[PDB]
C-alpha cells in the first residue's frame, strides 16, 4: 500500500480508539507481542509486512487512515 | 459544534500529542481526577469542560472532524 511508516504515537492512538490491547493487536497482525511493544516505544520502526499487517488490523477494526506523501496525517473512525 | 467526546477519542488524542492526564488537565483548566474519570467512562464531559478539553487538544496541533455533533476523525498538523 501507500503508507511507508507509522509513528509510535499513531500506533498507540489507534489502539486506544478501538480498545485494543497490545496482545490482541499482536494476534490480529501475526506479530510477537514484544515486537508490538517495541514499535510503541520507538525501539524499532515497523516496515514491510509488519507495517502492512498492523495497518490492516486497524482498518479491520474500523479505522481509516489518511495518507499524504507516505505518512499518516489523519485517522477517521468508521 | 462538538457535543460529545468519547473516552476513546480523549485517550487517543493524548497519545497523539504525548500528554499525560495531569498535563491535559493543566491545559484544560480542570482537575486531574475529572480527566481520569472521563477516560474511565464514568462521566461525560459537557459545557465548558468539554470545550476546554477540545481547545487544549487543538492548541497541541490536533484538528477534529465533526459530524452530527460527534467527533469522527482527528488530523495531525
Nearest CA to B60 among B27, B22, B12?
Answer: B27
Please tell me if residue B76 touches chain A, with a CB cutoff of 8 Å: yes
Q: How far is CA A52 from CA A29, A63, A64, A72, B1, in A?
A: 9, 14, 14, 13, 35
The label of the residue with cell 499482536 reads A26
Q: Which residues of A34-43 are buried (b: 16+ CB within 10 A; e: fewer)?
A: ebbebbbeee
Radius of gyration of chain B (CA): 11
- The helices-and-strands tally (H runs, E runs) of chain A is 4, 2
Cα separation, A54 vs B20, in Å, equals: 25
- Arch. (CATH architecture) of B1-77: Orthogonal Bundle (1.10)
- The answer for B 4-63 residues in CB contact with A (under 8 A) is 8-9, 11-13, 15-18
Nearest-5° Cα angle at B64, B50 to B15: 80
Q: Do the Cβ atoms of A8 and A14 come closer than 8 Å?
A: no
DSSP-derived 3-state class of residue A9: helix
Chain-centre distance of CA B25, in angstroms? 10
Enumerate the residues of chain A whose CB falls inside 8 A of the CB of residue B8. Answer: 16-19
Look at residues B59, B61, B49 and name the one whose alpha carbon lies nearest to residue B2: B49
* 3-class DSSP assignment, residue B46: coil
Calpha distance B66→B72 (Å, rounded): 6
> Which superfamily, per CATH, for A1-78?
lambda repressor-like DNA-binding domains (1.10.260.40)
**Structure-solving method:** X-ray
Backbone torsion region of residue A7, taken as left when φ is above 0, otherwise alpha when ψ lies between -120 and 50, otherwise beta: beta
Sign of CA dihedral A60, B72, B18, B35: negative
Are the Cβ atoms of B15 and A12 closer than 8 angstroms? yes
Strand-pairing partners, residue B64, are B74
The span from the CA of A14 to the CA of A38, in Å, is 16
A67 contacts chain B (CB < 8 A)? no
Q: Which long-range contacts (CB under 8 A, 24 or more apart) does B44-48 make?
A: B44/B4, B45/B5
Return d(Cα B23, Cα B35) in angstroms, integer.
10
Nearest beta carbon to residue A74 from set B8, B15, B76? B76
Of A12, A16, A66, the CB nearest to B8: A16
Rg for chain A, CA atoms, rounded: 11
Amino acid at each position: 500500500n501507500h503508507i511507508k511508516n507509522m509513528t509510535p504515537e499513531i500506533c498507540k492512538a489507534s489502539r486506544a480508539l478501538v480498545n485494543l490491547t497490545q496482545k490482541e493487536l499482536a494476534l490480529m497482525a501475526g506479530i510477537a507481542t514484544p515486537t508490538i511493544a517495541d514499535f510503541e516505544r520507538g525501539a524499532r520502526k515497523p516496515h514491510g509486512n509488519n507495517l502492512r499487517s498492523i495497518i490492516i488490523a486497524f482498518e479491520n477494526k474500523g479505522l481509516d487512515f489518511v495518507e499524504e506523501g507516505g505518512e499518516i496525517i489523519g485517522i477517521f473512525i468508521r
